[PDB]
Structure formats: structure tokens, C-alpha cells
Amino acid sequence: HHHHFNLPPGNYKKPKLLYCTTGHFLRILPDGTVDGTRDRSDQHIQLQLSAESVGEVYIKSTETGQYLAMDTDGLLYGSQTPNEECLFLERLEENHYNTYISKKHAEKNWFVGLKKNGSCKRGPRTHYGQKAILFLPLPV
């Protein structure tokens, strides 16, 4: 899809915590809100990734079943059902971190990203080079 294909190591057999280098874990709340928390004990940060195609993943809350998705204006939200806004290109970055580019808006490099204050970044505001788009997956 007009993007590199360096993929991060690891399988999808188990759920993961996605820690953003900006200091928060990615969280999908029951009401569909998406944000970040520093609390590892939070029950809405356990995420199950799955590959629909090599390098293309869904990111789902194991607690609520919601799928991470990015809307037409770049906002992350939790979707009850899988749609084209729920697919992300999972890639390696700096030979180490995991990044996620909205497949639907891949042409504009809209990434999944969290700000240091724990709020999500809007697609257009993200870009290569930011700490906000870098994730370090951890075991649950």
C-alpha cells in the first residue's frame, strides 16, 4: 500500500498491553472513548491483535470486544463491529518500536498515537519522528 514492509516480531497468540513511549497504555473504554492510562491494572488496556492479512491487523479490547478504529476526521474510537476504519498497518519503526497506520488513511500517514497528557492524537497531527506514534507491546 505504498509503504515499507518491515514488520515487528511477535505473534498474535496472546493479548498485549500497548505502551506508548509518551508514557501511557492504549485504552478503549466501554463508551467507545479511546485514550491512555498509566495504570497497568486498568481492565481496558488488554488488547488482542489479529492479522487479517500479513501486516494488517485489528486491535480489539478483550474486555469489551470493541475494535480500535480511526474515523474520517482522524479520531480514534471503539467500534462495536469491524469495518474498514478498524484495519491498521502494523509496522516496525527505528528497528524496534511498533507503529500502526490507519489502512483507510494510509496515503496520509495517519498513525495511532498518544500524547504525553494521555489524550489521543488526531490522525493529521501524527507523523514519522514523533514519540507519540511509538508503541512497545508488553505481555498481559
Does residue 104 sit in helix, strand or coil?
A: coil
The resolution in angstroms reads: 1.9
Q: Could you give the 3-state DSSP secondary structure of residue 106?
A: helix
- How many other C-beta atoms lie within 10 A of the C-beta of residue 53? 9
Count of all residues that appear for the chain in the document: 140
Cβ proximity of 86 and 100 under 8 Å = no
What's the 3-state SS for 3-65? Answer: CCCCCCCCCCCCCEEEEECCCCEEEECCCCCEEEECCCCCCCCCEEEEEEECCEEEEEECCCC
Q: How far apart are CA 113 and CA 100, in angstroms?
A: 8
CATH 3.40.50.720 fits 1-140, yes or no: no
Q: What are phi and psi of 35, to 5 degrees?
A: -160, -160
| Residue 124 φ then ψ, to 5° | -55, -25
